[PDB]
Ligand binder design. Structure first.
Ligand SMILES: Nc1nc2c(ncn2[C@@H]2O[C@H](COP(=O)(O)OP(=O)(O)NP(=O)(O)O)[C@@H](O)[C@H]2O)c(=O)[nH]1
Ligand SMILES: [Ca+2]
Ligand SMILES: [Mg+2]
Ligand SMILES: [Mg+2]
Length: 166
């Protein structure tokens, strides 16, 4: 059985925990409890392969990002998440890409750009704008909703498929 270590990063409140919990536990977390560092593990069949997913849910709030670098070190793939109704979270994606490059000491790390909360209508980040950012990094852009489940499996499974190409 193959093991894939995934790490979810991004600004505070963009929905990292809700996305992970929807994927793993199949329910939507409506409340906002800031994360320090949590991990989830689950066996799933992806494209015919039985594998073990180890997902690290990291802190987005600066005050709670103590040794985030250390926890991310073993990550093999990263979901860089921003919220489509939070322009600042989109503009700060570069901060996370930089951190990933540092922790992995590589400019070629499996990643997927995720625009979460696509169920909301106060959109300030248009799809095309995010597609362009992802293109510059040479990675896929996928929109998700931890609330409706739209694109959730697609985002995580795509990250696995990206790890498989590296
Ligand atoms: N409508 C909607 N709300 C969402 C979505 N994802 C998350 N939220 C809401 O946004 C708030 C923060 O989500 P949460 O998953 O805790 O964010 P986080 O990125 O994990 N925050 P932190 O970095 O501090 O740990 C919660 O109230 C949650 O319900 C989504 O896709 N749609
Ligand atoms: Ca609570
Ligand atoms: Mg969280
Ligand atoms: Mg605009």
């Amino acid at each position: 059985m193959t093991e894939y270590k995934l790490v979810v990063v991004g600004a505070g409140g963009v929905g990292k925990s809700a996305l992970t919990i929807q994927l793993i536990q199949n329910h939507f977390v409506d409340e906002y409890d800031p994360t320090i560092e949590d991990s989830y593990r689950k066996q799933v069949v992806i494209d015919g392969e039985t594998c073990l997913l180890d997902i690290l849910d990291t802190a987005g709030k600066e005050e709670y990002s103590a040794m985030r670098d250390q926890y991310m070190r073993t990550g093999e793939g990263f979901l860089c998440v921003f919220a489509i109704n939070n322009t600042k979270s989109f503009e700060d994606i570069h901060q996370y890409r930089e951190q990933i490059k540092r922790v992995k000491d590589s400019d070629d790390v499996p990643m997927v750009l995720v625009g979460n909360k696509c169920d909301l209508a106060a959109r300030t980040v248009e799809s095309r704008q995010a597609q362009d950012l992802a293109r510059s990094y040479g990675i896929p852009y996928i929109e998700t909703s931890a609330k409706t489940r739209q694109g959730v499996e697609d985002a995580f499974y795509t990250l696995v498929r990206e790890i498989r190409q590296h």
